[PDB]
Assembly symmetry: C7
């Protein structure tokens, strides 16, 4: 019915048997082998009893999980029970133990991925690299964290599909956390159709001025830049860039578009025109 | 005929032999080695009997599977039977045990893929990453789940061919579940042939308005966007995007086409024309 | 001459020697070491006899295979015979056993590919992923199965060359079976030179109608689609697709060509013309 | 309450039990097995006591970390306690020890990544390859170091997102330290539309002169170069380059732009014009 | 001088020593250790004698191979001789045996490639994937087999250079045998400049007729095909293909050219012209 | 204070204890276990003393390195001290030894990279592949050697940044030494716009003559070449090349430019003009 | 001074000590442990003496190599000496042996590359794949062999830089030997601007005739070919090829240029002109 009975039946059987053997030998002397064999067989029987009542108990309340557990647990204890009494009796100890050992690391290397996922899940619960809702990018996958488990994490990628990442990928690869950034950084390239480069400096400086007198820019770490990155026949390329304050994602788009339009306005104000890549 | 006879013949032979040896020694004292050898040889014979009857029993009802099982099982017990009585007799114990051990992990590393498939099949029956009929994408393969087994899953890919994926690929790679998405997300790029960028803001805003007053859009998480992503000589590129409600797959196509046509309509309404990439 | 003599010579020699030793000790007491050494050396001699007669017997009936087997078997039993009597005599047991053990897993890791091929061949005879004549695609190779063995499969690829695939590639990679498909799926893209997109809907719908009133289409799972996938200056791209009934391979080509011609006919009927990618 | 009680309860119980057993045997002789079993069980109980009070003590002051530690520590000592008394009692020693050993290296190979991160963190604290604030580039990631830990380093990449690099990537890959450079090096390519190559030498030499009479160049290691790298129909390509003094990052941009403009000025002074790639 | 003397000197020394020790102990009792030490040292000396005589014998007839063999064999027996008498004497048995064991698998993993080549050479002599003169393609290499060895195969590639392929590449990769094909297969694509697609069917059918009334085609498995694979503005693409009978390599070229010219003739007969990709 | 005291305190304690035990047993006989336990515990205490004195001594003179060493050394000896007295006392020997062994190779495989770096550093100090100042190229990295250590080498790459290469990359990859070359080799391709190929031979020969009558060419190994590599409509491509004497890096550029200009001069002298790729 | 003294001091000390102990026990009986400890410590001292004398002897004649050897040898014998007397004394045998064993395979896997290089160097001295001066191509590297060692080979690549290839790359990759070819093979493609393909056969045949009546062609294996590989609007592509006799490298260039010019001559003789790819 419970653990109490599952113990008190084998315990009483074992005490009965050893008390029998004691007065079977006192009034040919293999008390130790028989007693050890009885102890081994009795608790093999006891955990069989305990296993059955446990997986009968939660079947008395996620169902195929329970018999998957039942069958896996039955195989496991069949294995150990066979090993243990083969060792208690003394018949073919090293042979059966060698078979069991090679089966064990067969299973132990075949299960390196499940174990990797579990151990990496624990390591992640220690050093939290992200939390629920953060937009992360792990190697090839990218999205919003929607579920954190022990063997897998669940993301929502750019097409708004739920992705399932095994947790052993967060220990061998870098993780980008797009939700902990304190300032953003934009950079673009504008092509110019220009032959009188004598006004590339002026334009450049003016654009930088525009980027410094613009709200939503961050002048704390790096200054806005706009330099000539390559030149060609009636062609030039300006590389613009700056840092922006911590903003949302529609405001980032609006700021990018606004900076681009103001830069093109400054460019066309000096009589220059855009080029063609 | 059954397990009963397959046990009662070797058991009676063994009891006969040990009872013979007892009065062969009472009225030179190697009772233990001979008794252990008899026990080992008798149950080697007993499982041979049990194996033969079991694979004769289901041959008396998927046939080449049965003798594949028969031959594999015969090799396995030949191996263990040889190890066990070489150990019971005492002749060349460590030599034969070392040979058997190196053969065992030869086989145990050669079989890492079959074991990986089986263990990953079990791990998947615990943490269900998909179910029958879901459209998944695992690494390089993509399709509808049509069969779930213990060592392989079966998909139906985009050309409507049945693919057979070994289950050890669902533990080391990410799984995209295209059937559990609750809202979709579309994004496109429209090129414009425009020289007066002074009307890029207006157009943009109007398009966003259109995307918000459109049924089948989802205004719960992110707002529709339409920003200028790059500019060029009489050329510009608008990046449009939005989220859509949970819809089928022909309605997704219809909505994409409709959004694209309405956007081009708004663009041409402002006197702008499409560009050429 | 046979197994009978190959056993009855060493067996009689061994019985003679042990009977000699018994009355050599009865009328200095190392009966066990000498008897075990005699047993080990006698059956080493017996399997040497058995090996020679077996590979002389099938040489008395695929010939270089036989002496390859002869030499490999001679090396193997030289190894085990050396290990076993070094252990029976008692001279340098652990040294020679360690040498033999490191040689054994040297050989056991060097032979991981042959063992992988054999074990995967067996695993495939259990879970049949294809049969003789099927057109499969395994990773990088594609063709018709023309031979199925235990360590290799033989295909006939697209240039009609016989390919030889090691069977360990069918356990780590996905297998596409192009001969078990129950319906096909075609998809194409048509470019249009169009400036009045006001007739992209009509055209689209008409094409879909054509794809539904066409025999050899399969309306069981997905409906035919034809949507606008991208637009450009006097340019548009229609993505067409449908499912087809289970048909041959020349009928698939004919149906593709027919669908394409009918679609272009519908397109040109509305005054539109094809574009240029 | 503390370590003192957690030791003095099991120590007094053990001393009581051994003193009982001594006069239980003096006035059947298995003093050693029972005493060793008592010692093993007593300190198993003692560290259980010590573990509970330690993880109750820092729960009496970063909380889910504490019970993660509690559960992991409970599993670990359950394992060792089971192994140790199975060995003290003598029941199924080698079987349980083999099970524990295969579980141990299952866990020891599954945890190769966490251990790699920790050991590489230590190795890095010995041979410091960078310090806080340096701009490094490790394999595929690049940014400013913002945090140095034992299992992970934290960078700030080019988009100003915090990246989390596992420390086992700094032992197998090269590390570029962009903050310890003592002089910079710029190089560019200018295309020329020229048919009279008789003035390619002159131009070249003049440009080099310009690069040597420019402040912010470093004439310590290599001389400025400007050579003809390939020629074509009315086309040529000059490859320019030089070293610059240790400067900031906006001054590097300004110097690049200035050198490029001066070079194009020299080129157009000789009646040559820029070409088109 | 020979094996006879190389045995009869150590054998007589050993018999002399054991006969001395017997009457040294009969008229302090460590007969077994000294006798085992003498046996070990004597045959260590005997194989040293045998090794020297053998590699002096074939030096008395490919010379640097002989002393490479001499030095390697001297190192090997120095190793085993040291292990064996350290074990015979009894001084530091487990220490020296552990050193020797870690050296052994250091060497046994360092030599995985040579062993792989040898074992794969044997596996190939069993399942012959090609023979001398066949034109094979193994992974990245392609050519005519000009030599088959035990650790390497020799090919003659397309530039007519001798390539040396390690035999461990024929067990992990697919092998294409271009000399066992029984029929060939050609396929080409012809672009058409056509606006009246109403004659794409006719042309197609006519071409197929041509491919069936052509000798050197194989109508046993698949029928000749010619279908429209994609269409464009005044552009179309016909995909032609057929099977050819088993022919040489200049006849294959001639047949390809002939089929192509006849197809273009049929195309231009219907007033169509070739297009431009 | 020093090693002398750190030894003479535990040595005197141990001698005192063994002298006590001797007359505690002479006037119950477990002299060996207690004496071995005392010896083990005493030198565990002695190296603890020695370790503390050593890492206190160099803290009395690169500081965080010292306590990193202190903590690592404390963990290591805690481990060995626990193993050694668990083995001396006799309580749970095999259990604790198995735990320690699986921890040991966990650490021994986790530290394969640090050990690889150290061993490869030693191997490099034996077979010197480069020296300080040489310009090497190892796999993906290239630059001037500026520091050679035991676990890492330091380079200065093309952008003049200090790179840090782990020394285990110089044992698995090829190393190009650009500072030990004794002659250089240049090669270029010139396109020609030519329709009368009847003067391709002449031009070619003339160019080769020019390359042989040029100082700074090396006529020791290979002769200068200039051949027609491919032809096209009013287009041809000459492939030129030669060897140059051992020269600097600005002289190499000057020689390349000079050879190119002289070749174009010869080409235009024959009425030919350059083509357009 | 030499090996004689380095042996005769420890040998005389050991004989003195054992002779002392014999009459210390004859007139408490631990002769075996003390004698074995003395033997172990004495030869530990003897090889220390021998090591110092040897690396002092070649320091009395490539110097940093000598102390690198000295320190490595001192560490190694410190290790073995510690293991051996810990085993001779009997204090913490299995603990120290386990530590030494895990250190040993840590070192034995960390040194897999050096051992791979050495073993592959030996394997190459057996099966010589090239010799000094041959032009080989191993995987990604190509050049003339200028030095052959035991752990590395030295090449001279196409830029005439000395490359250093680890010898473990010649056992896992294919080796192309460009110096053992007995005939060469050239192949080119000529584009034609042709609309009347009725003269593609004639031209083709004529070209083949030219290739057969040309000296320096090899008509032993394959015949010269020239076939139409693809056609297009006023465009065609002829694929030409043949085998050439064994010639140098400037004669190969001359023959290529000559064949190309003669082919273009034949082409233009038939009124055809070259096309434009």
């Amino acid at each position: 019915k419970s653990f109490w009975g599952a113990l008190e039946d084998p315990a009483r059987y074992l005490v009965t048997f050893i008390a029998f053997a004691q007065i079977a030998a006192m009034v040919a002397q293999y008390f130790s082998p028989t007693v050890k064999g009885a102890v081994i067989l009795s608790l093999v029987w006891f955990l069989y009893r305990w296993k059955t009542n446990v997986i009968t108990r939660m079947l008395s309340a996620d169902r195929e999980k329970v018999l998957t557990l039942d069958k896996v647990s039955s195989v496991g204890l069949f294995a150990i029970g066979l090993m243990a009494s083969a060792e208690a009796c003394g018949v073919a100890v090293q042979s059966i133990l060698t078979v069991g050992g090679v089966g064990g690391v067969a299973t132990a290397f075949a299960a390196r991925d499940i174990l990797g996922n579990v151990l990496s899940g624990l390591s992640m619960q220690f050093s939290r690299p992200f939390s629920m809702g953060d937009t992360i990018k792990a190697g090839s996958v990218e999205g919003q964290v929607i579920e954190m488990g022990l063997t897998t994490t669940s993301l929502l990628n750019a097409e708004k599909f739920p992705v399932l990442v095994p947790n052993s990928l967060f220990s061998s690869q870098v993780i980008v956390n797009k939700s902990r950034a304190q300032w953003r950084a934009i950079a673009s390239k504008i092509p110019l159709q220009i032959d009188d480069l004598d006004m590339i400096p002026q334009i450049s400086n003016e654009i930088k001025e525009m980027l410094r007198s613009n709200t939503k820019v961050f002048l704390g770490k790096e200054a806005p830049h706009c330099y000539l990155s390559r030149v060609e026949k009636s062609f030039a390329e300006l590389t613009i860039g700056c840092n922006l304050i911590r903003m949302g994602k529609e405001e980032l788009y609006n700021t990018q578009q606004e900076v681009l339009l103001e830069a093109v306005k400054i460019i066309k104000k000096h009589g220059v025109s855009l080029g063609t890549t």
